[PDB]
Design an enzyme around this catalytic site. Structure first.
Site, PDB file in Angstrom:
ATOM      1  N   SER A 245       0.841  -1.184   0.000  1.00  0.00           N
ATOM      2  CA  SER A 245       0.000   0.000   0.000  1.00  0.00           C
ATOM      3  C   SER A 245       0.882   1.242   0.000  1.00  0.00           C
ATOM      4  CB  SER A 245      -0.941   0.004   1.206  1.00  0.00           C
ATOM      5  OG  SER A 245      -1.866  -1.062   1.137  1.00  0.00           O
TER       6      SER A 245
ATOM      7  N   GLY B 184       1.699   1.217   7.563  1.00  0.00           N
ATOM      8  CA  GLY B 184       2.919   1.245   8.350  1.00  0.00           C
ATOM      9  C   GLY B 184       3.973   0.318   7.783  1.00  0.00           C
TER      10      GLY B 184
ATOM     11  N   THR C   4      -9.663   6.395   3.534  1.00  0.00           N
ATOM     12  CA  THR C   4      -9.925   6.154   4.949  1.00  0.00           C
ATOM     13  C   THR C   4      -8.916   6.832   5.870  1.00  0.00           C
ATOM     14  OG1 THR C   4      -8.646   4.101   4.951  1.00  0.00           O
ATOM     15  CG2 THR C   4     -10.970   3.962   4.330  1.00  0.00           C
TER      16      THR C   4
ATOM     17  N   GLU D  24      11.882  -6.684 -20.611  1.00  0.00           N
ATOM     18  CA  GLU D  24      11.473  -5.961 -21.805  1.00  0.00           C
ATOM     19  C   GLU D  24      10.392  -4.932 -21.504  1.00  0.00           C
ATOM     20  OE1 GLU D  24      10.282  -8.700 -24.774  1.00  0.00           O
ATOM     21  OE2 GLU D  24      10.059  -7.233 -26.392  1.00  0.00           O
TER      22      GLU D  24
ATOM     23  N   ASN E  67     -10.691  -7.762  -5.519  1.00  0.00           N
ATOM     24  CA  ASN E  67      -9.448  -8.509  -5.643  1.00  0.00           C
ATOM     25  C   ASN E  67      -9.427  -9.352  -6.910  1.00  0.00           C
ATOM     26  OD1 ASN E  67      -8.211  -7.591  -3.215  1.00  0.00           O
ATOM     27  ND2 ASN E  67      -9.529  -8.978  -2.043  1.00  0.00           N
TER      28      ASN E  67
ATOM     29  N   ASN F 202      -9.705   2.993  -6.032  1.00  0.00           N
ATOM     30  CA  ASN F 202     -10.888   2.316  -5.521  1.00  0.00           C
ATOM     31  C   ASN F 202     -12.128   2.712  -6.311  1.00  0.00           C
ATOM     32  OD1 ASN F 202      -9.507   0.961  -3.376  1.00  0.00           O
ATOM     33  ND2 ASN F 202      -9.504   2.881  -2.215  1.00  0.00           N
TER      34      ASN F 202
END
Ligand SMILES: Nc1nc2c(ncn2[C@@H]2O[C@H](COP(=O)(O)OP(=O)(O)OP(=O)(O)O)[C@@H](O)[C@H]2O)c(=O)[nH]1
Ligand SMILES: Nc1nc2c(ncn2[C@@H]2O[C@H](COP(=O)(O)OP(=O)(O)O)[C@@H](O)[C@H]2O)c(=O)[nH]1
EC number: 3.6.5.-
Lengths: 426, 434
Positions: free
Chosen positions: B138, B142, B177, B252, B226, B204
């Site tokens: 992400s 963290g 969020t 490539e 997903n 999103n």
């Protein structure tokens, strides 16, 4: 693993958990003997966070029960779920605070603080890495506001690293509950702004206004008012106890909200809330559960939400929900209520969704907000605190215990700087 | 032979990897318990890039799951896909970083970074043809930002020349969020410019627009999102997992699509992406979906592609496609003038056609279509997506809000200032080259 103790002190916080552990008992399928009877192991795979299993599965809650008298001990002990608690933790004194801070802090609380300090140490030695503490007490009375005040001043000597949840009731503008209630507020918050991380200012007054309109209940039993406090706290820690599409621990709830090391004074909210007969006649949509969360009705404290600004919006949604409709409407509130937010902080909505609803519903919403109208909570008490210091009344219950006059004024200056910091960004 | 390793860091690394490796078990005929049925050996033609052999056909994924939190990892260790992965490849954490940089860059990461780099080296020494890395992360996490930047800081010391690929989610300017996502996106761009070959971004909301209109999914969640991303992942691997007439390897891709070593951030697109009913009343030709590639209701990042300037547009086709109308439709794109290039690059095209059509997920919302396009289009609309995020970062930084978490965790505040001058000239270079 990530382990949290729950400590109760004072007559208020001792009976809040007494209904609150019941829901925590019932959400995970255990018994007053601690016998696990959950059918799915989803109620077992995170049972360890509040329990220490020992000798054939009688789970004991990681709980400490402190009082200055044996009055509240036996009522919890002989009452419901009395056999579940460990009798090692039943530590108490023989004084009673008599609604006196310096008794609870300097005189009588200084004796009993040593016994449970090792009890705080003992259950924390048997774990790999602690996570944070949760504390239920009072700010109006004398026992919890005098003894639980000093306890946070010694947790940081043991653990200067983790988080501190200090849940406590607060005074109301309408009817005062005790006589020294503005004295028990300014002297407590003087220590709460020093070493705490969150307080939830729940008014006793507005909880009836929740029950009078939504629940329509003519007979408010004190088991039922704490029951609405019970379902609020269980929705906060749903990520650590249940899986989902997005998990958010107590530190993530901490780091997203508090912008400056004083402004962490948050009010909670919960939806849905109504009586029995209005079940089918309304809709269980994302849109109906949205606008309930942003009403003055859902304000558990008696402060006006359109007299402030939402800084950090925490949406802890519980149940199988569509993510896009959550993504739809959390945009739509800022397109409606842009004046109702702080302007210079963009994207004020924080969303955490666990896919498990609480027992009794199909889709619920656990709200915690940061309105800057909570500045008025410390405006109204700073005048009542300075209503009686100008006449020096009740000084012989504090200086007779050995309290300084500067201990008032040092707290009084730091009380008035607190409302200046809400004023800084409003 | 050639063997590619995947690394999954963060919760976005967990469940996107729970879809991609789920999808590959379908496209090679491998049962999720760990072994293969004997019918899928002829389908299993050069599947060696991901799956080591063990004993009797038992195929472990060359994949590493990295998380600071044991919760979502136990979802893998509960479902059917538990026995597929290797246990010592699963390295878990205990204490969470909570979307904070130095909690994910120094605190819990530095107790676990030495365990996982061995498991990198334990698996990579089997390789004689080690190509690249699938690292999934992400931007506001963290461990999504703090550990990912530190991880790419160390593998370039180890392997260097060998390639890398990053997949991630572009934070939306309206609906997102975590409040620290404007902070950490500046942090994960700071030192990962030097330590990443290419990094991809999706929105999103740009998924949601095709989900509501074309898929007609009015209750989507992180289950079906997903699956849609994983089809874009699988279409790149179809150039490698199968035998095509004109296909392309990972070295490539970066050679064509990186004009300058700093601006190396294209995005993705997929078409036809509709429901199962609307393909019945329509004969989707080559010129149908290729013209559908270059309309703004098809991009996977919600921005303005017409206000961006295309520099190197890459095309990978799947299914039985003849090259004649391919050589016509891309020329027919050039007959239209809204597709703007730069003056110095007319020859920024890539031709790739594989024989295998995409196979849809069982029980999913898609439809079995022979033709499909995975469009990759590096453009100057990324710069317009930089200014929407550079506006968020600086104004919260000016009041110094939320700084009191970054201080005590082993982190300096001047590093925020150096990333400002770093990201200022970056979005300048889109206009400088353009
Ligand atoms: N769509 C989608 N986004 C995800 C998912 N998991 C994580 N994310 C994104 O990840 C961002 C923040 O990173 P997190 O995954 O929450 O945290 P992390 O990467 O695990 O890093 P830590 O803080 O150390 O735990 C969020 O803004 C999400 O958008 C997922 O399963 N689906
Ligand atoms: N909602 C609720 N509030 C309570 C209850 N018991 C006490 N309180 C609150 O606690 C405050 C009194 O503090 P208390 O702990 O009883 O006095 P102390 O024992 O001397 O510290 C009052 O403002 C009450 O509103 C209860 O059962 N329910």
């Amino acid at each position: 693993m990530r382990e949290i103790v729950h400590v109760q002190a004072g007559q208020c916080g001792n009976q809040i958990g007494s209904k609150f552990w019941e829901v925590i008992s019932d959400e995970h399928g255990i018994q007053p003997d601690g016998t696990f009877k959950g059918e799915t192991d989803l109620q077992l795979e995170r049972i360890d966070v509040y329990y220490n299993e020992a000798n054939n599965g009688k789970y004991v809650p990681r709980a400490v029960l402190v009082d200055l008298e044996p009055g509240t001990m036996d009522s919890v002990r002989s009452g419901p779920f009395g056999q579940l608690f460990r009798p090692d933790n039943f530590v108490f004194g023989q004084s009673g605070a008599g609604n006196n801070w310096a008794k609870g802090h300097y005189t009588e609380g200084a004796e009993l603080v040593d016994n449970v300090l090792d009890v705080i140490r003992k259950e924390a030695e048997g774990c790999d890495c602690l996570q944070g503490f949760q504390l239920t007490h009072s700010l109006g009375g004398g026992t919890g506001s005098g003894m639980g005040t000093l306890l946070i001043s010694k947790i940081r000597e043991e653990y200067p690293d983790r988080i501190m949840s200090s849940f406590s009731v607060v005074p109301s503008p309408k009817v005062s509950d005790t006589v020294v209630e503005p004295y028990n507020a300014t002297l407590s918050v003087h220590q709460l702004v020093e070493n705490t991380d969150e307080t939830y200012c729940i008014d006793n007054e507005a909880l009836y206004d929740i029950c009078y309109r939504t629940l329509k209940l003519t007979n408010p039993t004190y088991g039922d008012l704490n029951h609405l406090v019970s379902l609020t706290m269980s929705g906060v820690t749903t990520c650590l106890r249940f899986p989902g599409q997005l998990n958010a621990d107590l530190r993530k709830l901490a780091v997203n909200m508090v912008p400056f090391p004083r402004l962490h004074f948050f009010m909670p909210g919960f939806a849905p809330l109504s009586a029995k007969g209005t079940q089918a006649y309304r809709a269980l949509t994302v849109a109906e559960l949205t606008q309930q969360m942003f009403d003055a009705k859902n304000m558990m404290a008696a402060c006006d939400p359109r007299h402030g600004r939402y800084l950090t919006v925490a949406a802890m949604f519980r149940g199988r929900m569509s993510m896009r409709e959550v993504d739809e409407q959390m945009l739509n509130v800022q397109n409606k209520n842009s004046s109702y937010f702080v302007e210079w902080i963009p994207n004020n909505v924080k969303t955490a969704v666990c896919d498990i609803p609480p027992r009794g519903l199909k889709m619920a919403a656990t709200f915690v907000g940061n309105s800057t109208a909570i500045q008025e909570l410390f405006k109204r008490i700073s005048e009542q605190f300075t209503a009686m210091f100008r006449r020096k009344a009740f000084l012989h219950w504090y200086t007779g215990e050995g309290m300084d006059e500067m201990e008032f004024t040092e707290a009084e200056s730091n009380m008035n700087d607190l409302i200046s910091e809400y004023q800084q960004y409003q | 032979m050639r063997e590619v390793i995947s690394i999954h860091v963060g919760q976005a690394g967990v469940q996107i990897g729970n879809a991609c490796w789920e999808l590959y078990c379908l496209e090679h005929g491998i049962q999720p318990d760990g072994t293969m049925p004997t019918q899928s050996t002829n389908e299993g033609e050069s599947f060696t890039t991901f799956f080591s052999d063990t004993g009797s056909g038992r195929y472990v994924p060359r994949s590493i799951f990295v998380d600071l939190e044991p919760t979502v990892v136990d979802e893998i260790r509960t479902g059917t896909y538990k026995k597929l992965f290797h246990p010592e490849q699963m390295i878990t954490g205990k204490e969470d970083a909570a979307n904070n940089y130095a909690r994910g860059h120094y605190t819990v990461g530095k107790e676990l970074i030495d365990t996982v780099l061995d498991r990198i080296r334990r698996l990579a020494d089997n390789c004689s043809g080690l190509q690249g890395f699938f690292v999934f992360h992400s931007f506001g996490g963290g461990t999504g930002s703090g550990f990912t930047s530190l991880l790419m800081e160390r593998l370039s010391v180890d392997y260097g020349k060998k390639s890398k690929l990053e997949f991630s989610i572009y934070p939306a300017p309206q609906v997102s969020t975590a409040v620290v996502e404007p902070y950490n996106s500046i942090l994960t761009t700071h030192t990962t410019l030097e330590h990443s070959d290419c990094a991809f971004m999706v929105d999103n909301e740009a998924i949601y627009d095709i989900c509501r209109r074309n898929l007609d999914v009015e209750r989507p969640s992180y289950t079906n999102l997903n699956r849609i991303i994983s089809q874009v992942v699988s279409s790149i691997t179809a150039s490698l997992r199968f035998d095509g007439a004109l296909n392309v390897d990972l070295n490539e891709f970066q050679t064509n699509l990186v004009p300058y070593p700093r601006i190396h951030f294209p995005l993705a697109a997929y078409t036809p992406l509709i429901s199962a009913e609307k393909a019945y009343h329509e004969a989707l030709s080559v010129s149908d979906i290729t013209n559908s590639c270059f309309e703004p209701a098809n991009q996977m990042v919600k921005c303005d592609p017409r206000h961006g300037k295309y520099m190197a547009v890459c095309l990978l086709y799947r299914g039985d496609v003849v090259p004649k109308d391919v050589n016509t439709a891309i020329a027919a794109i050039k007959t239209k003038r809204t597709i703007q290039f730069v003056d110095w690059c007319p020859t920024g095209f890539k031709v790739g056609i594989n024989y295998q059509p995409p196979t849809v997920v069982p029980g999913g919302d898609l439809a079995k279509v022979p033709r499909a396009v995975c469009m990759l289009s590096n453009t100057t609309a990324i710069a317009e997506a930089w200014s929407r995020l550079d506006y968020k970062f600086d104004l919260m930084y000016a009041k110094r809000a939320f700084v009191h978490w970054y201080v005590g965790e082993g982190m300096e505040e001047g590093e925020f200032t150096e990333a400002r001058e770093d990201l200022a000239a970056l979005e300048k270079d889109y206009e400088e080259v353009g």
